[PDB]
Every structure is written in structure tokens, then in C-alpha cells.
């Protein structure tokens, strides 16, 4: 039961279906009590019988509507379960990830399969807390909440943090994702080499893997928090370990376009 723009109040239709049900059920007893003409006792029991399903599941016998404005289906129960309005679609269309990031990608020529390159400005937010802590370890901040402030305005970030951000990262890796993830290669993991700008420097060889060219596709980065997760990620999911096709013998990372041209 929420508060919005001034008097504007928000609330799942469900509440209205319930009230309905309550007032009926209540008129029930109260009716029976005060003597009892048959026609009515049923009429009410009938109405009630309708209400009972209302919240349970609408449209399976009829559709009740909030007083005029929208002939909208007060979203009954299963409707939320099943996603009888794309709800399930968006549901199994995944949730959201706390430590995500999406940018534009760019070729990283002299890069190495093993690595990948994301912008600091990005990295900074990403493993933010892993940084806060390192922040307190170095003398660039005494305590957390404090350090937090340091990293709140771009202008107050001493050029000592970057060195700190470099630490955190060292060893660690992240995952990059393409638009339609069609196969396992669809997501691959690299140890980021902090770069400049606003762009994600991706390795040429893997462009075959992620069907991805460089005219404006954007990849997404994922941070594997868990010492366990990070652990698996940089062992069984690190690009440089999945050179062949799980679909057929043929290798996936192979000399492409320009490269061939030269050799």
C-alpha cells in the first residue's frame, strides 16, 4: 500500500478483490442473522461464490474491473504465478545483478587471450567495496564510511586509488557477455587490465566465439564475488581454456579475418 505523487497512492489490485470478498462474506452472516428470506441468502451466497474465485483466479468465469478507468483485469493470483502477462517471461528473463556493468566494446590487438580490458571508471564501481577495504589498508583512508566519501565525487579521487584499484584486481578476473548468448562460449572470463576511457577492449580471437564485430555491439561485465565462484571462473570458464567447439571437434578461437590475410 504505497504513497506516490502527493495524494497518489499505489496498491496491487489484489487488495480490491479481497475487500470485495470480505464485504460479501460479512453481508452473508449479517444477512442470515436478521431473519432469512431464501432468494437473498443464495443471491448473496452466489455473489460470494463469484468473489471467492475472483482473487483465486479471474477470467475463468468472468472479469471484474476496478471502478471505471481501465477495463483492466485485476491481476488475480495465478496471473502472477504463471506470468499470464509476460510476468514469467520477465521472471525467467532473469532478475538483475548487483555487480554488473555494460559498455561498448573495442578491439584489443596486442592484448592477450588471458586478459581483457575494461575502463577504470567502471572497475571502480564494480569491486567498489573490495576497494574500500584496500583503501583502509593503504593510508589513503583511515576507515570505511570515510573512504566511501573519498570515492563519491570524481574530483576528490587522489591518483593513489588507481594504484589501489590495480591491487584489488591483480589475480582476479571477470566475465564478459554478448547480446544473444547462444552457447557456453557465450560468456568468457578474463583478468582485466585496467584501461582508459569508456570502452571495453576485447581480444580479437574470441570475436568468433561471441558473434561480435566492432561497429557498436556492447558487452557486459560480471564480477564473480565468491572466492569459490572467482575460483571456478578463472579455471574452467576462462576463455583461454575453451578453444574448441563443444558442438563439434573444430576449434573456436582461430586465426581470423585480417590475421589470415597476412600469413
Amino acid at each position: 500500500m504505497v504513497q506516490v505523487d502527493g495524494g497518489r497512492f499505489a496498491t496491487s489490485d489484489l487488495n480490491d478483490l479481497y475487500r470485495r470478498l470480505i464485504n460479501r462474506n460479512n453481508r452473508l452472516k449479517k444477512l442470515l442473522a436478521q431473519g432469512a428470506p431464501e432468494i437473498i441468502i443464495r443471491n448473496e451466497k452466489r455473489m460470494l461464490q463469484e468473489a471467492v474465485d475472483a482473487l483465486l483466479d479471474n477470467g475463468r468465469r468472468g472479469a471484474p474491473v476496478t471502478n471505471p478507468g481501465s477495463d483492466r483485469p485485476l491481476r488475480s493470483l495465478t496471473d502472477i504465478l504463471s506470468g499470464k502477462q509476460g510476468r514469467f517471461r520477465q521472471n525467467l528473463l532473469g532478475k538483475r545483478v548487483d555487480y554488473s556493468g555494460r559498455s561498448v566494446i573495442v578491439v584489443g590487438p596486442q592484448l592477450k587471450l588471458h586478459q581483457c580490458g575494461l575502463p577504470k571508471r567502471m572497475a571502480l564501481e564494480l569491486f567498489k567495496p573490495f576497494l574500500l577495504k584496500k583503501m583502509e589498508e593503504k593510508g589513503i583512508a583511515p576507515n570505511v564510511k570515510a573512504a566511501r566519501r573519498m570515492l563519491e565525487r570524481q574530483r576528490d579521487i587522489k591518483d593513489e586509488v588507481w594504484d589501489a584499484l590495480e591491487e584489488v584486481i591483480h589475480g582476479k578476473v571477470v566475465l564478459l557477455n554478448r547480446a544473444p548468448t547462444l552457447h557456453r562460449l557465450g560468456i568468457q572470463a578474463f583478468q582485466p587490465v585496467l584501461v582508459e576511457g569508456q570502452s571495453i577492449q576485447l581480444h580479437p580471437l574470441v570475436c568468433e566465439a561471441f558473434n561480435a564485430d566492432f561497429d557498436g555491439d556492447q558487452m557486459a561485465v560480471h564480477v564473480p564475488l565468491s572466492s569459490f565462484a572467482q575460483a571456478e571462473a578463472r579455471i574452467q570458464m576462462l576463455s583461454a581454456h575453451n578453444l574448441l567447439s563443444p558442438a563439434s571437434g573444430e576449434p573456436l578461437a582461430k586465426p581470423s579475418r585480417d590475421i589470415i590475410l597476412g600469413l
Partner: peptide, 12 residues
């Protein structure tokens, strides 16, 4: 099958 009529009918 749609309430209203039944009652309106049952009454009459």
C-alpha cells in the same frame, strides 16, 4: 453462466 439474470429471474 453470468449471474444477474438468474437472481433477477429467481426473484420474478
Amino acid at each position: 453462466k453470468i449471474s444477474t439474470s438468474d437472481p433477477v429471474r429467481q426473484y420474478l
